[PDB]
Amino acid sequence: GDHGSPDSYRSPLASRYASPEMCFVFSDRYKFRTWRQLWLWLAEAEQTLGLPITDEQIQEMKSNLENIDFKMAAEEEKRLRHDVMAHVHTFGHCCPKAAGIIHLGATSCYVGDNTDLIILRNALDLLLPKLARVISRLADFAKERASLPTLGFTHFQPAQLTTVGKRCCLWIQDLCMDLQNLKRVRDDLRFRGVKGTTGTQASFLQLFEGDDHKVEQLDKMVTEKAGFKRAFIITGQTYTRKVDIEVLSVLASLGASVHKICTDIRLLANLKEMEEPFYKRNPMRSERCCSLARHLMTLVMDPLQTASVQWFERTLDDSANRRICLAEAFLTADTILNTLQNISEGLVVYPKVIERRIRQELPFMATENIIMAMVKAGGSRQDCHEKIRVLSQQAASVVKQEGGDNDLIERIQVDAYFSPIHSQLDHLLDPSSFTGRASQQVQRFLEEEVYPLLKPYESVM
Amino acid sequence: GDHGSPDSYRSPLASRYASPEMCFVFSDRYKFRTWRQLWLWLAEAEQTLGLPITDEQIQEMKSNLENIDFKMAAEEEKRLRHDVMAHVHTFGHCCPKAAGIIHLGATSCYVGDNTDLIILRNALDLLLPKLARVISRLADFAKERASLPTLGFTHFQPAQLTTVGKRCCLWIQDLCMDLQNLKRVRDDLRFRGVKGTTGTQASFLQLFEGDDHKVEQLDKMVTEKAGFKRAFIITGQTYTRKVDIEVLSVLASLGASVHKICTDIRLLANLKEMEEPFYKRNPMRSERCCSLARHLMTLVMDPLQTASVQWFERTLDDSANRRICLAEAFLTADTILNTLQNISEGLVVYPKVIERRIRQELPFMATENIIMAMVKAGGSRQDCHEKIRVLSQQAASVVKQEGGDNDLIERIQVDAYFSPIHSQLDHLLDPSSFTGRASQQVQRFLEEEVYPLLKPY
Amino acid sequence: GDHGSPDSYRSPLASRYASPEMCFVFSDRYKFRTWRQLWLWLAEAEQTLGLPITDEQIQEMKSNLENIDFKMAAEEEKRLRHDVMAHVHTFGHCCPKAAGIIHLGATSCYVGDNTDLIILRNALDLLLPKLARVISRLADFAKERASLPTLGFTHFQPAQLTTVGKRCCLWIQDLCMDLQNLKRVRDDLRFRGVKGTTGTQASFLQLFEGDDHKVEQLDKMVTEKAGFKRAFIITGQTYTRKVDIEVLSVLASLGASVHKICTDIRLLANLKEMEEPFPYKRNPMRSERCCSLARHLMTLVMDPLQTASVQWFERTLDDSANRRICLAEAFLTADTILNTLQNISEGLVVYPKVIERRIRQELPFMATENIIMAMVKAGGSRQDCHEKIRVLSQQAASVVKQEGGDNDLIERIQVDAYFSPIHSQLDHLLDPSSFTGRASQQVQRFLEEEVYPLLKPYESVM
Amino acid sequence: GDHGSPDSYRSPLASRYASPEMCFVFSDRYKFRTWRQLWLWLAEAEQTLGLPITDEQIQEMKSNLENIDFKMAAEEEKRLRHDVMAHVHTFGHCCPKAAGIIHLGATSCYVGDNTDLIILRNALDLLLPKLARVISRLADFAKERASLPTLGFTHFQPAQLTTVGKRCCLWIQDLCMDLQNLKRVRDDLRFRGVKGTTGTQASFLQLFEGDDHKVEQLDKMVTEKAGFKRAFIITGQTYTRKVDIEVLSVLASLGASVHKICTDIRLLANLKEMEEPFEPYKRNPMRSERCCSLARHLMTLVMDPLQTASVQWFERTLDDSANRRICLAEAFLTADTILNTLQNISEGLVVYPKVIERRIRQELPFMATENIIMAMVKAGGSRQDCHEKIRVLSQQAASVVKQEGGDNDLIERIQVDAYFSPIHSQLDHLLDPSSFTGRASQQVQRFLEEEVYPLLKPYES
Ligand SMILES: O=C(O)C[C@H](Nc1ncnc2c1ncn2[C@@H]1O[C@H](COP(=O)(O)O)[C@@H](O)[C@H]1O)C(=O)O
Ligand SMILES: O=C(O)C[C@H](Nc1ncnc2c1ncn2[C@@H]1O[C@H](COP(=O)(O)O)[C@@H](O)[C@H]1O)C(=O)O
Ligand SMILES: Nc1ncnc2c1ncn2[C@@H]1O[C@H](COP(=O)(O)O)[C@@H](O)[C@H]1O
Ligand SMILES: Nc1ncnc2c1ncn2[C@@H]1O[C@H](COP(=O)(O)O)[C@@H](O)[C@H]1O
Ligand SMILES: O=C(O)/C=C/C(=O)O
Numbered sequence A: 001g002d003h004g005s006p007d008s009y010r011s012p013l014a015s016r017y018a019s020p021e022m023c024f025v026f027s028d029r030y031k032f033r034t035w036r037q038l039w040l041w042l043a044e045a046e047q048t049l050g051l052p053i054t055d056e057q058i059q060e061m062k063s064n065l066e067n068i069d070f071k072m073a074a075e076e077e078k079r080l081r082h083d084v085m086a087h088v089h090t091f092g093h094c095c096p097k098a099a100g101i102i103h104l105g106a107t108s109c110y111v112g113d114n115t116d117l118i119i120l121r122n123a124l125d126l127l128l129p130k131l132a133r134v135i136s137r138l139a140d141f142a143k144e145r146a147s148l149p150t151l152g153f154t155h156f157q158p159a160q161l162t163t164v165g166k167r168c169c170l171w172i173q174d175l176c177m178d179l180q181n182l183k184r185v186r187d188d189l190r191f192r193g194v195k196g197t198t199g200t201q202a203s204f205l206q207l208f209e210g211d212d213h214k215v216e217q218l219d220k221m222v223t224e225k226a227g228f229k230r231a232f233i234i235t236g237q238t239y240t241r242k243v244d245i246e247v248l249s250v251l252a253s254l255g256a257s258v259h260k261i262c263t264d265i266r267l268l269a270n271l272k273e274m275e276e277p278f279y280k281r282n283p284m285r286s287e288r289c290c291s292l293a294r295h296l297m298t299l300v301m302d303p304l305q306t307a308s309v310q311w312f313e314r315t316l317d318d319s320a321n322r323r324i325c326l327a328e329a330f331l332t333a334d335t336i337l338n339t340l341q342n343i344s345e346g347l348v349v350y351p352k353v354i355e356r357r358i359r360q361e362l363p364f365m366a367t368e369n370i371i372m373a374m375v376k377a378g379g380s381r382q383d384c385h386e387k388i389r390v391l392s393q394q395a396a397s398v399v400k401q402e403g404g405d406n407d408l409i410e411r412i413q414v415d416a417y418f419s420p421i422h423s424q425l426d427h428l429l430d431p432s433s434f435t436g437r438a439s440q441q442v443q444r445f446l447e448e449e450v451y452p453l454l455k456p457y458e459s460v461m
Numbered sequence B: 001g002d003h004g005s006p007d008s009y010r011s012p013l014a015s016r017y018a019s020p021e022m023c024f025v026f027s028d029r030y031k032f033r034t035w036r037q038l039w040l041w042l043a044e045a046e047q048t049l050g051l052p053i054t055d056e057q058i059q060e061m062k063s064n065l066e067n068i069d070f071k072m073a074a075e076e077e078k079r080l081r082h083d084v085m086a087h088v089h090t091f092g093h094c095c096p097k098a099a100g101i102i103h104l105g106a107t108s109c110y111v112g113d114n115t116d117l118i119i120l121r122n123a124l125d126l127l128l129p130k131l132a133r134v135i136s137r138l139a140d141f142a143k144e145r146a147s148l149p150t151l152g153f154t155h156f157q158p159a160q161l162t163t164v165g166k167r168c169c170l171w172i173q174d175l176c177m178d179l180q181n182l183k184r185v186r187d188d189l190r191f192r193g194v195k196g197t198t199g200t201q202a203s204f205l206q207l208f209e210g211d212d213h214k215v216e217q218l219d220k221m222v223t224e225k226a227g228f229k230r231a232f233i234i235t236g237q238t239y240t241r242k243v244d245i246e247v248l249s250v251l252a253s254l255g256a257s258v259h260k261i262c263t264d265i266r267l268l269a270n271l272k273e274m275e276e277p278f279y280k281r282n283p284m285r286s287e288r289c290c291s292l293a294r295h296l297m298t299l300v301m302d303p304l305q306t307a308s309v310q311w312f313e314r315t316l317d318d319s320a321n322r323r324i325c326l327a328e329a330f331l332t333a334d335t336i337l338n339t340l341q342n343i344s345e346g347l348v349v350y351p352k353v354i355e356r357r358i359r360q361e362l363p364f365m366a367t368e369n370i371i372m373a374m375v376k377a378g379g380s381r382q383d384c385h386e387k388i389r390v391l392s393q394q395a396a397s398v399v400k401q402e403g404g405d406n407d408l409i410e411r412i413q414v415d416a417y418f419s420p421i422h423s424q425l426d427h428l429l430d431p432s433s434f435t436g437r438a439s440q441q442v443q444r445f446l447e448e449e450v451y452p453l454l455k456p457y
Numbered sequence C: 001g002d003h004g005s006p007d008s009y010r011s012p013l014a015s016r017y018a019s020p021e022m023c024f025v026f027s028d029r030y031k032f033r034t035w036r037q038l039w040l041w042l043a044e045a046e047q048t049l050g051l052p053i054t055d056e057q058i059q060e061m062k063s064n065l066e067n068i069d070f071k072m073a074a075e076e077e078k079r080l081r082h083d084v085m086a087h088v089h090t091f092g093h094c095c096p097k098a099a100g101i102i103h104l105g106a107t108s109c110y111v112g113d114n115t116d117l118i119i120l121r122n123a124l125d126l127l128l129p130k131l132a133r134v135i136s137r138l139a140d141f142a143k144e145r146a147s148l149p150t151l152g153f154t155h156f157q158p159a160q161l162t163t164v165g166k167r168c169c170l171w172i173q174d175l176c177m178d179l180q181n182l183k184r185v186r187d188d189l190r191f192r193g194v195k196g197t198t199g200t201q202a203s204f205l206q207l208f209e210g211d212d213h214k215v216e217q218l219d220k221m222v223t224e225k226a227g228f229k230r231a232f233i234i235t236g237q238t239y240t241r242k243v244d245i246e247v248l249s250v251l252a253s254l255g256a257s258v259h260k261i262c263t264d265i266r267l268l269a270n271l272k273e274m275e276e277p278f279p280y281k282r283n284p285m286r287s288e289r290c291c292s293l294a295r296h297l298m299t300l301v302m303d304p305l306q307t308a309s310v311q312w313f314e315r316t317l318d319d320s321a322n323r324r325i326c327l328a329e330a331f332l333t334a335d336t337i338l339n340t341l342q343n344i345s346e347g348l349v350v351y352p353k354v355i356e357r358r359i360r361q362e363l364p365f366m367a368t369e370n371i372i373m374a375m376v377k378a379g380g381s382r383q384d385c386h387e388k389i390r391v392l393s394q395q396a397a398s399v400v401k402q403e404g405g406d407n408d409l410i411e412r413i414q415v416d417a418y419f420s421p422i423h424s425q426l427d428h429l430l431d432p433s434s435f436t437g438r439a440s441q442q443v444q445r446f447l448e449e450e451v452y453p454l455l456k457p458y459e460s461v462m
Numbered sequence D: 001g002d003h004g005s006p007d008s009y010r011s012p013l014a015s016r017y018a019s020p021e022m023c024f025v026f027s028d029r030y031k032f033r034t035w036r037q038l039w040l041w042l043a044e045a046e047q048t049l050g051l052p053i054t055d056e057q058i059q060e061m062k063s064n065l066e067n068i069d070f071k072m073a074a075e076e077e078k079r080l081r082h083d084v085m086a087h088v089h090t091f092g093h094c095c096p097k098a099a100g101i102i103h104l105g106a107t108s109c110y111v112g113d114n115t116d117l118i119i120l121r122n123a124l125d126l127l128l129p130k131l132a133r134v135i136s137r138l139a140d141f142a143k144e145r146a147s148l149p150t151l152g153f154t155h156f157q158p159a160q161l162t163t164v165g166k167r168c169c170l171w172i173q174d175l176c177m178d179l180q181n182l183k184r185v186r187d188d189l190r191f192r193g194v195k196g197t198t199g200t201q202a203s204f205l206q207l208f209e210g211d212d213h214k215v216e217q218l219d220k221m222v223t224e225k226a227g228f229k230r231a232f233i234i235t236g237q238t239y240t241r242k243v244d245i246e247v248l249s250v251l252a253s254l255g256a257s258v259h260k261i262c263t264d265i266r267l268l269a270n271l272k273e274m275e276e277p278f279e280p281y282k283r284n285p286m287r288s289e290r291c292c293s294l295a296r297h298l299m300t301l302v303m304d305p306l307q308t309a310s311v312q313w314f315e316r317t318l319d320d321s322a323n324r325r326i327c328l329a330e331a332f333l334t335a336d337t338i339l340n341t342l343q344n345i346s347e348g349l350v351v352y353p354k355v356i357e358r359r360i361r362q363e364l365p366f367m368a369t370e371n372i373i374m375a376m377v378k379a380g381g382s383r384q385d386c387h388e389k390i391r392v393l394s395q396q397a398a399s400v401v402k403q404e405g406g407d408n409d410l411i412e413r414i415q416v417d418a419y420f421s422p423i424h425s426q427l428d429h430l431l432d433p434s435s436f437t438g439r440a441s442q443q444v445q446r447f448l449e450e451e452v453y454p455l456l457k458p459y460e461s
């Protein structure tokens, strides 16, 4: 009824995950509406350029763009075993006056391929502000936490202190590259236009009695009507399936970024340092994003393979595949960005869990700070280094062998050797003094790189 | 209605491609009904093993296996953000008596993982007879055409003659390897059974007051009820997702086979030697098979990646992915097998086209046999080789430079140097003499390898 | 030099990673020596079946199996742009008496494909005992640690306790499935044998003057000489490239398993519960490397899938360059991973006092039901007790997250006279060995029923 | 040997396929010379910026950039189990005065990552002119063959005529999209620069005693010394591995293009319409087969960096290292080989016009029937009636072809039928192949003038 009977398989991307907006863009109502819209634009342009098409035929066509008899369309397709021709017949039935001029000069891909290009670009236009919003919410988080010291991890082992906001900027930088990629692909998408069966426009040239200029005009007119700046000069029957690679490749790369970000979030949730928005709390949304982002990456192999084995001016082995992977890649991407937005709005941070971890690990990373202090006081770097080695091993043994807390500072405190440095210990181990340039980097990044990127999307934040 | 509104995305695998039977196996009806079947079996087993579950509670559960309020379950899941708990609640709603004991001792995966294993095996069982049927129909074609000479192709260039039937056996053999793969994975599939939250059955042990024999018997009892010969001993929360790799990998390899087979048919269609069953005729069914087969191959990277990053006793980042890739792999495989059967039932061959192509190419492959005939006629191999070489270059130029028919045999016939073999030319150029052991290979293959494999189906 | 001068690219798989044994299996010496071995076996069988081949011709070839002039071969291949014909000519140069009968009746794939099948089987035979050894070492660890309680993880969040040994069985099981896979593919690998240019044996049938029996005998005999139980009946020019899918698919699956296992170890290394074999701060670098290589193993499966899908008719040569890369690389990658995993599995470091601490911080939240059950057994209510134990768990969780302190939930219960009926039981109720379920029982049954039978064939090489 | 002894595995990419120039770029000599060049630049800039480095330390480091003791470095790496530190120690041993300031403040990635970025960019600079050269050769072919009619193929079945040159433009267009992608990735490549252990420059900030300006100057000074216009602001330990996805994705899409082009060439070769250049009746399209084989590996390799980036934890994990040693080099050596081979193919492509012409003659009559019907309607005949008469003749001709294995005799059937007497005198004209190719010829001209030549202009050299 809505997403269908439960007695048959229903894609989870439709019934469970994707927004109504993205679902509609990949719906048959939208597909077949656009087929008629393209047929109308064709008749309109053809009428202007002199072909015998009456205003009645245009008005009739224009008044039935939504008037789609799916039952009739289905029966015709069972009969003809051809989907475009099924719809040509069905459109001509409710438009009896224009029936004879519908699809005039065109091959099936005039509606099929141009609709897919309109769908791709409209789908890209849906993703962009959703991605932009996720980036803005994280940028707010990053700026807010820019100076909050946190344990750094390499090999997922204790490393030089970063900040929560600086770490957030690694996430933001990858998503920003995705925003630029998606925009580039949307902006550079070209219209197939009117090209004919094998790309030569032979049909249209005959209809215009050899007038090459009128053929070029028609192609320009339908392109403009479709809202595209530019059409291919060169096609076979179809737009080059290299286009489908370009689109799904940028979505795949977005998948990898989201999977990385959400893996980091899941690890922070184990560490109790950060948690998804409101005893056992599971980072289920981040896990979902990983799950769906993995499918995005997997799907890139479909268009790669498809384009690689397209023979000459077209083989029809692209069709069933594209029905699946194009829609599912955008429905998957839509779901991910909707969820990441929801995650990024109220990430819970626990400063005192973060501080406890730093206090347990920083003493082992601060030994050169201690030597420097003792040497400046007039001690020996060689004598000091030995003393710290032993006390550090003692502390390490407590942590590993006994499961105790790190007591290195306490050992240094009660050892008389470090007499000239006892009053400095609190300053020397101040975690903010160990975070390098993290806060200055966050500011400069957001200002120079992030905010300029977001400016176009302020309207819808 | 049945597939839903055209105002929303609908999977073409559902609305366009897969059979009703496969669509039902991956339907929410079948799934949640099976969830309830597993709860019934559990309560039955747990009752036999002494837990406080009454007969009338079990009657209540059995009477309601199909009575599923999908609207309520969706209301609960919106509220609980937990799918299995929503169905526990909803089953407990229409079963007020048994409500207290549904899911007793189980974790979510008890219904979720076991249902997937039941579904995977049922799906495999739907595929197997269809694949056997394709093989059977192709075997019929291979037998009928076992001796029909046809131009061999290597580098897709003219090569040593094969037969139509022998070439078909290349196709059959790959599909036989798939049939064996699918049957193995089906037969080796193990039930998760009752394992508790992290795989230790700590819940059931406590319910049975430390009695291990009862905990093992429960696992055995529910496994048997589900009709599985064997259950896992070792699990985390889930069955190992390596299982999903094993299943989709064999599906991926089936895809590769069908893509190659259908690519060959498409090329033969261009050559006008073969056509799909009944001016332009397009091998559309073969093209669609290729299209879908490619998706089957692509899908293997999903379970590979999933398994690689499951942490400890399980992470929930397998869940959304599996909802998509498992169903799709099987619905795609189903479609391909349904279409491949259609293709295999009336393949059209054009012997006269096949013959004409052999006549254009065989003379170039027949020159060593002409030379052999001259040598034994009291002649020189080196002289003949040079004479035959110039005429073969002459004929090759007519073909490529003049777009003409190959006239090499006519050139040989009129050149008096070949007087010692002129009377043998009809014999020397008989295409059936050039196919080597192709028909005998077909006979032995079908007899020894194919027919024994089909005998159970 | 051994791996060439540093002024050109050199594969890390050869210069850095794989064992010498696996490198040699994928060497040109081994390849081209096997070409010659195959030529000798063909001449042997042909002579037996009556073709005009002499004992001295066979003696000559046998004497020169290893006497490969690589420079001459390269020179000839530059002239002929054909690798097999280059080696036919080179072999005939050093075997002048045999030159005329080398490769008699055969197409190039007689040496190319059959050598690849010999290599694949030999390569699997190198991997098998290495995996068996990894499984056995982990099985020893699993038995040793079968009762050692450890915090369970689902969502990587605290869950019902498992044991260190039981968790190891999750890893072992996957590798046992791989071991079975590799053995199956190895055992079921069929020989191409002698098949001719398009698979019809037309050349051989003519040589034997139409005697079908003799062609069938030839194929049997060379298959037997190469040590294979079974040859294909049906081929085009090549063995079906579906074979390459079957082999690299099992390697890909092994890759996923090792990636999972080594990710778990790296996570245990962060938690300080387990470390790699022998400093305070240590990196799981070997596990990281195994993950890095395992990923390449999974990636490589798409090569033979694609290759097989677009082979036209009796074969196209677009498989050749690809197979030179992916078959060797997959095995060199797999070999390295198993060499490293063996090393990781020997002396895995465990820290029971870190494990215990973590358990004590998390168990009380998972033990509330037991503390309630004990009150109801004493005489208290379950509705009343569940509420009072709720609020204490709330404050303890807040101490952990808001204060950043230790879990004081058991102290809150201890210092509260409502839980007076059960105060003396608290240690018994919180005994972590009482929460591990059937973990240790499962380890024993698994090892005895599933693991040890698999390992028994490999006992002499352990 | 020079590729090593035949007793061990040797990559066919080095031993067999790639050019010596691309082999050199991914060689250890080039890698470790660049490590030392980077150490020289770090010291140079550090000296200028006031750190205690002498001129004879710099004179020493500069004079030993090529004097690499690989044996010593290998010994050191076995001992340290650390490749970078082995080379710090080895470089310090031949530069004993400078030993104590080599790598000052830096982490291993300073040399590791920056060298990889230098190599990636130099690798892309080798490919670019090669791809431009292929496009240029193909454009000459397209121009020469712009108007030559050839049978169109859709479903790989006879379709509306195109031209040899127009079909070549489908190939050219995909390669032009690749040239733009590679150029884009190359230009947008950012330097990692000096970032420290976890990306915070804490080491350098200390060395400059809190002077942030000097840390920023150092990052700019080395970035500029390396010939890069821009450095990252935000890194962890490493440059984001999304960079590797971006680079191998464009190579993967290039593989798809080449696989399609070479598949078409292989099909044309079967049809005897086109052949690879002469280096002879049975000829195999072996170069094109090889290109398809390698292209496939290029497409396969994209899943490596996708997976790598998706599971990088925090400021980095070392599970990327081994994978990248394989896939980055292999992708570029594979790409290099394809382009070398494709240029070779494109240089003397052979066309057989009489074969092409014969195929057209066999197939065109069946596509000419609508045009014959139109000429009869113009002469006074009924469309419906004429369609029926011509349909029987057409079905008779198709049966001669398929059932008798004969030549298409449809035109002869029409010529001797008195029914078609009104158009008999027009048949020669109605069946002219050039008249069926539509705008194919003008499309080649416009495409080459507007979209190809401007892209090639910069590469003139
Ligand atoms: O415009 C034409 O019809 C000309 C034809 N090109 C085609 N162009 C577009 N669609 C075509 C084409 N051919 C078939 N079909 C129809 O597409 C449908 C494919 O079904 P599916 O494989 O399920 O996606 C399915 O309905 C097919 O009938 C050509 O010969 O070049
Ligand atoms: O036995 C034959 O030669 C018959 C031929 N089949 C072939 N079988 C095996 N190898 C062949 C074949 N053809 C070429 N080549 C040679 O393979 C080599 C391919 O080189 P690469 O692409 O670099 O791997 C390269 O050396 C090629 O020359 C056929 O026409 O069916
Ligand atoms: N450990 C678990 N086992 C089974 N299901 C779970 C678990 N944790 C959460 N879930 C639920 O499983 C579903 C996952 O949804 P999805 O990510 O869309 O597959 C959600 O309803 C979760 O609440
Ligand atoms: N954080 C790091 N950055 C760079 N290199 C490292 C780091 N940690 C270890 N290494 C070294 O990098 C090399 C990784 O080797 P492989 O995994 O074979 O590429 C080894 O020599 C490691 O010791
Ligand atoms: O909800 C469950 O069934 C399991 C949850 C978990 O393991 O965290």
Ligand SMILES: O=C(O)/C=C/C(=O)O
Pocket: A154, A155, A159, C283, D107, D108, D109, D197, D237
């Ligand atoms: O050895 C290094 O350069 C870095 C090591 C680390 O980050 O752990």
Ligand SMILES: [Cl-]
Pocket: A105, A106, A107, A109, A110, A193, A194, A195, A196, A197
């Ligand atoms: Cl059109």
Ligand SMILES: [Cl-]
Pocket: B105, B106, B107, B109, B110, B193, B194, B195, B196, B197
């Ligand atoms: Cl359970």
Ligand SMILES: [Cl-]
Pocket: B282, B284
């Ligand atoms: Cl069709």
Ligand SMILES: [Cl-]
Pocket: C105, C106, C107, C109, C110, C193, C194, C195, C196, C197
């Ligand atoms: Cl052979």
Ligand SMILES: [Cl-]
Pocket: C283, C285
């Ligand atoms: Cl390390």
Ligand SMILES: [Cl-]
Pocket: D105, D106, D107, D109, D110, D193, D194, D195, D196, D197
């Ligand atoms: Cl640095």
Ligand SMILES: [Cl-]
Pocket: D284, D286
């Ligand atoms: Cl060749």
